[PDB]
Amino acid sequence: YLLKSPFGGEGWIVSVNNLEDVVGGHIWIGLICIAGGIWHILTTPFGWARRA
Amino acid sequence: SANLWERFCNWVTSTDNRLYVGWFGVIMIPTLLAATICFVIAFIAAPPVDIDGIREPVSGSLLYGNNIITGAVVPSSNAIGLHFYPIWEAASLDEWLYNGGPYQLIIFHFLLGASCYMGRQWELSYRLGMRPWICVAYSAPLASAFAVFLIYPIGQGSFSDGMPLGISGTFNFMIVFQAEHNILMHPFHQLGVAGVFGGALFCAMHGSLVTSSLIRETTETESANYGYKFGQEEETYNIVAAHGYFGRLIFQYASFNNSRSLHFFLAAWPVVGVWFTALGISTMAFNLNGFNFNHSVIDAKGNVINTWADIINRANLGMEVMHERNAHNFPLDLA
Amino acid sequence: METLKITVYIVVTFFVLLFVFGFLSGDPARNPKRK
Amino acid sequence: EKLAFYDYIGNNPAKGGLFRTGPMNKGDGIAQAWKGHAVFRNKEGEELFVRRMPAFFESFPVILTDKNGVVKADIPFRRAESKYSFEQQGVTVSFYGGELNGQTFTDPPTVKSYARKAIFGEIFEFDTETLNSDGIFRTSPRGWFTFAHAVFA
Amino acid sequence: FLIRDQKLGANVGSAQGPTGLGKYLMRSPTGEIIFGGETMRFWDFRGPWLEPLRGPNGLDLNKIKNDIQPWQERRAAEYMTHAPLGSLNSVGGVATEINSVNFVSPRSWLATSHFVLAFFFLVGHLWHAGRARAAAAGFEKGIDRESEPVLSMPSLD
Amino acid sequence: ELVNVVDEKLGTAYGEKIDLNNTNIAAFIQYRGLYPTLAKLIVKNAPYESVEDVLNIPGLTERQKQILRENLEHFTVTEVETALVEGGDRYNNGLYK
Amino acid sequence: AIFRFLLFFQGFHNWTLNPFHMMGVAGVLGGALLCAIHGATVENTLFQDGEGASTFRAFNPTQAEETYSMVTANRFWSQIFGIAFSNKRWLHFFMLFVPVTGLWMSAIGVVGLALNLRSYDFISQEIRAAEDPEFETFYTKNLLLNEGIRAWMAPQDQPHENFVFPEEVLPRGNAL
Amino acid sequence: TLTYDDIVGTGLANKCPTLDDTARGAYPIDSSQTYRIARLCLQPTTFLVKEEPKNKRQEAEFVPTKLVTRETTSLDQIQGELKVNSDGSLTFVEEDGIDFQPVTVQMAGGERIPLLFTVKNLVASTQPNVTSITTSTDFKGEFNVPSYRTANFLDPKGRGLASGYDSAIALPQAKEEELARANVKRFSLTKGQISLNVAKVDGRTGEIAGTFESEQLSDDDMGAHEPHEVKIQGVFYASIEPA
Amino acid sequence: AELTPEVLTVPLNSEGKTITLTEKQYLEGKRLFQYACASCHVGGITKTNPSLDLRTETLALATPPRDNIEGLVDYMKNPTTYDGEQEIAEVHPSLRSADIFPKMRNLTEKDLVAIAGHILVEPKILGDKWGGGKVYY
Ligand code: CLA
Ligand code: CLA
Ligand code: CLA
Ligand code: CLA
Ligand SMILES: CC(C)=CCC/C(C)=C/CC/C(C)=C/CC/C(C)=C/CC/C(C)=C/CC/C(C)=C/CC/C(C)=C/CC/C(C)=C/CC/C(C)=C/CC1=CC(=O)C(C)=C(C)C1=O
Ligand SMILES: CCCCCCCCCCCCCCCC(=O)OC[C@H](COC1O[C@H](CS(=O)(=O)O)[C@@H](O)[C@H](O)[C@H]1O)OC(=O)CCCCCCCCCCCCCCC
Ligand SMILES: [Ca+2]
Ligand SMILES: [Cl-]
């Protein structure tokens, strides 16, 4: 979905059209999200992250 | 070489360039040259465009019978809607010029660059140590091009409904808009004209007050302008005499004496008003139109007593009923 | 025609990289004082 | 003739345009003669009247009514449901005095042609060749002098 | 209307409209059969009520011809008369409509409110980001009368 | 010479009565009980050489034939005009309220 | 009651196509730009004369030094737009000129609409549209919008004319 | 088989089905069993426009042209009875279907040539005595070519046939004899020739395939100018079934 | 210039007998007509089929006659085509189909009578406006 065009037809995120993907996708976000929650708890911005 | 890339970044970002090609500029300069170059060629030699997707080409270029006032670059086909139509999406250019391909190449590059143009209006201010926000004033006119060239089309379902790139083509966008949205009767447009009228008004106020209260340093037969040297220390006009006059025209507390508060107002007014006008077009892009007072006031029996609001509806129906002659096949105009 | 697509794509990548790798290059640094 | 001529919207200074240059003749053409008064009637013999063109309107519709102002005939846009087409009404036109004096015309097209003309008042015969006219109304000196002085002032 | 007129004995498949494109059905740019009229711009619409009529090539002339179900006819009618068109004072319909049906689609309300908010926030972004960059380097309160940066740079003139 | 076949048609029977060979289907809504069912049959059943030939549409129930007989005075018939029949214009000629 | 005045002028005088009305807007629109642009240029090109963030108080009601860097402003625009002021006396006179000249022009255009001496059509366009039915510009399109405005409005907008336009005479596209 | 989504945007939807190199058989005709065409389909490949020999009549030929519109050319869903005739021939008679598509092609000059590529009211026939449909079993016949634009179409100045203006209202006092042709709209109706010559049969499923060539006139624009002669070559696919 | 009981006197049945509504019923109908009709019959027209309107004359030539309280009422219970040769309760709101058109569930015989009265009273007040469309707005 994220690699989908945002123009006519291919509509990107808004083209989601069935609950499996909705539910499925949220499963991924929940994990991917908490994963980053721990990662930041356990870290500091790198170098560029700081010089940027 | 202190390091090529290290150098490159020093040039790009250099504040010693006649024209500040910035980081945003690296995106701006090319997109804007494409938009401009494609436009000029289109406007001069492009052939007729089937704007309404009904195989009824509208020629809008000089070489095909148009003059500066009528001529324009016509919007992509309605057959195309919101689909992306890059040249590499056509069997040929002949096909691309017929479905209004140039339009997209132009609006997209322009809107892209005009944004970076904003990003730049920030960058240079940074490299020069001046406060930001100028770029925020430019967010209003930009937010309009956006509303008129992209939001409205997204909202309406087709780029063919975006404002054409030409004088008369624009009047078309307006006249029809009014018919389908009754914009004159919408709060946001009104705020828009207040800002524009007001702006021009204030622009004249300031302009005159100041120019009229300039300290004499010039001859009777010498341009009053010379009385100013680029890089002066003190002011060139008596802002206390200015306020003295203006305070008496209306009344003291209704007059500015703080040049900073004056200039903030001077910028705040138009920018805020145009912001609303842009939000109007971006809002009526989802069919939340102006007030509809048709047949509101009715008499004791039920008869309809007209108001100017009704005389306005007739003029609107004329537009509705005549625009896009051959494009409709059904009762309701839902597109 | 399939070529032009390729070329255009390349060309836009160049500039977009030049852009990201640009502000990345310690842009805050570039300015009159505090950096 | 002179009298009939003043009763033609083509001499109304209010018709015209800012960049519609030249004499009034580059417009409708050099007036040659008065075709005559046109009287329109419908199958029943009833005499109809052509609603004239108000100066305000660049273009105006052909509508015909009787003495009491009742619409009796007209030239339809959408024929799909026309109730008053000159055809359905047997509209005819007769002339009195002038070029066409004493003549009558009954073939729809010709009747409508003249009806289409009645709109401007008395119907005349123009020479469009000479000045290579375009048939678009231009204003009289009265009009220009007025525009120029109102601006200068 | 394809449904209506078809009941009056019209052959939707071969009906020719004013422009010669196809009153009821036409083709999209890539060949698929879609509804005709200005609605050619929405040929990307998919929906429960309309799908059962779609074939492998888009709207199937046989299903359209004898598989249209009543619940669909009234669904199409319902949705037709509840398009997201309305006025600020909530008068459902086109700007030239008459008062009576007080309605403005929730989809219109939501979409507009959030574009305004979304927008002003982008201004908010620019504004607070512009302030932060000047604040950091430290000049968000004015140019140092003394050390005026511009004054130390060569003239481009 | 050049002529607008339609404006000319309005000078004939069509233009005075419901033309069974040209007039659009909606025209039948101005008489009692002709619209839905019968108008479809009349239009669907090609041209007629004479008004009565309508009474001959295959299947017409005895009552329908009755009704038709009653309204014949409101019908006529003229050469089929393409400009008026092409495009399926007899089922929808682009006119609504 | 003023909006109909606008719609009227479009419909009857095709006022938007008038050279003078255009100048008019170029001035009002362009004047509302100088306004906004100059204001912002000043507020973001100010010297620091206070220790606060709210720089409004930091102003000397009693002249003396320029409160904003006229020299910095010049360089800014000179690098972002290519052109830039550098004579506050002119920059301010310009601001009087632009919108006052604009409104003056928009007036002349109307003084001409009084006599109906409008800028309604382009003759070369009309002539080609007559002979050739496939020639279509955004101009011709507009003129049709006008026809509709006039036909559908005239009745209740000019009561004294007792207009009666039979449904069949009313110009209308397909379906609508 | 592929679902809608499996075709959407590929352009595949504007392509008549195809038979494989194998299917070169023959379908049998009972001559005592009615047959119909469940699905005729025509896909254009080329549009040639015969050029006007200028005044110097020197015999004109057809020339290729670029398709300025897009992949919207195909005719599909054609259907009707394929009655067997006394002499043992077959004549197809169309009833309904997407039997026409407005096409527009450009030329050397840059001229756009719009036509209403169609086969409305087809009446194709074959050779007498045709017990079974073999490869190349020529079908030939005529069809009708209705005006490109229908009765209600209005020109840029509002003039129309069934509706619209009576004249050049922009030139109120101009001579009219010269404008005659462009004010009075005429609705053209003409005949066309086509020939469907088979190449692939498949008696198994009763589905033949092949190539066609048809000729017809282009848009005369409500009779404002002369129509161009057009030739169209492509391929077709038909589904024969007892029914 | 008022809504007199003289104006609220509309035909009850086919045999000429009439009924007189009251300013309460009227308003009430008008409200109900908006609640379950305007959606498609705003101003006496018919959006999903512009060929049939609510003009009294149109209802007069209907089959059976639907230009009186009794008529319209029957219709709101068991709808038919203009020739009456076909029941359409499945794609038109009616009492026998409130499961499909909920808005029609509340509706009681009292309500049906008001809606009907409104339809016969409106054209009496508005006139041509009621039947025609935008042409009359
Ligand atoms: C881009 C959009 C655009 C823009 C920028 C303009 C801009 C302009 N228009 Mg155009 N217009 C447009 C689109 C646009 N128009 C379109 C699409 C149409 C339809 C065709 C028109 C139709 C139109 C008409 C019909 C007219 C204009 C006029 C004008 C000009 C004058 C407005 C003015 O300053 O009044 C300022 C108002 C005054 C009369 C000044 C005196 C007022 C006093 C000082 C106020 C006293 C206030 C009092 C203290 C307050 C009490 C009030 C109480 C409620 C609180 C201006 C140049 C006008 C013009 O050109 O006239 C010469 C004009 O008549 N326009
Ligand atoms: C929303 C909450 C959130 C926030 C505020 C942050 C914030 C941060 N993250 Mg964390 N992160 C999160 C969630 C979040 N993260 C999650 C859920 C994960 C698990 C996947 C991670 C994994 C993660 C890693 C592995 C790292 C960070 C790092 C960082 C820091 C620098 C990031 C940076 O420089 O980006 C700017 C990045 C660029 C220069 C690339 C621009 C290109 C983008 C991706 C594409 C273009 C965008 C386009 C506009 C969007 C369209 C959609 C697209 C799909 C097509 C920053 C403090 C970095 C760090 O310093 O670690 C301590 C680092 O290495 N994060
Ligand atoms: C300033 C740079 C610039 C930019 C931003 C654009 C932008 C655009 N161009 Mg223009 N163009 C430019 C310069 C530019 N152009 C120039 C100089 C020319 C003349 C040669 C053109 C000629 C041109 C044509 C002829 C056309 C366009 C079109 C377009 C639009 C769509 C193109 C597209 O689909 O991109 C999508 C591209 C991507 C998906 C890539 C984005 C890059 C990502 C972020 C990189 C991913 C990283 C990658 C894996 C890195 C490799 C690994 C690394 C470690 C080495 C787009 C608005 C088209 C148009 O107008 O359509 C409506 C079109 O037809 N352009
Ligand atoms: C006779 C003069 C006249 C006047 C007084 C107005 C007045 C107005 N116009 Mg109109 N207008 C005019 C001529 C006039 N117009 C003409 C000739 C045209 C062209 C045909 C238009 C076209 C037009 C348009 C298109 C629009 C307006 C709008 C408006 C309203 C806001 C305008 C605005 O923000 O201006 C900007 C100027 C200012 C910032 C000045 C503010 C001054 C106001 C009037 C208040 C003054 C205070 C009051 C006197 C009380 C003080 C008392 C206190 C000390 C105790 C305002 C009621 C807008 C509208 O409808 O919105 C509701 C709108 O959209 N006008
Ligand atoms: C292929 C082809 C042929 C293409 C054709 C394309 C096409 C259709 C284009 C046609 C264009 C066209 C003909 C349009 C007609 C418009 C037109 C000419 C209108 C008539 C104008 C006219 C004479 C009427 C009178 C009204 C009038 C005077 C208005 C003029 C408005 C005007 C020029 C204002 C300019 C505003 C502007 C952008 C200037 C900004 C100046 C600037 C950089 C200041 C910034 C700044 C701010 C500070 O605060 C300080 C301190 C400093 C230092 C400083 O610098
Ligand atoms: C697809 C990719 C295509 C790529 C093409 C190839 C690359 C670029 C080639 C450029 C050749 C043309 C030279 C142009 C010169 C110039 O501008 O002045 C030369 C000056 C002097 O600088 C400078 O010149 C100096 C040398 S000299 O003084 O000229 O000797 C030099 O040392 C210094 O670094 C330099 O900044 O240039 C600058 O100030 C730097 C920035 C340039 C701005 C570019 C133009 C902007 C366009 C904007 C968009 C507008 C839209 C359209 C409207 C009209
Ligand atoms: Ca040729
Ligand atoms: Cl239009």
Ligand SMILES: [Fe+2]
């Ligand atoms: Fe100032």
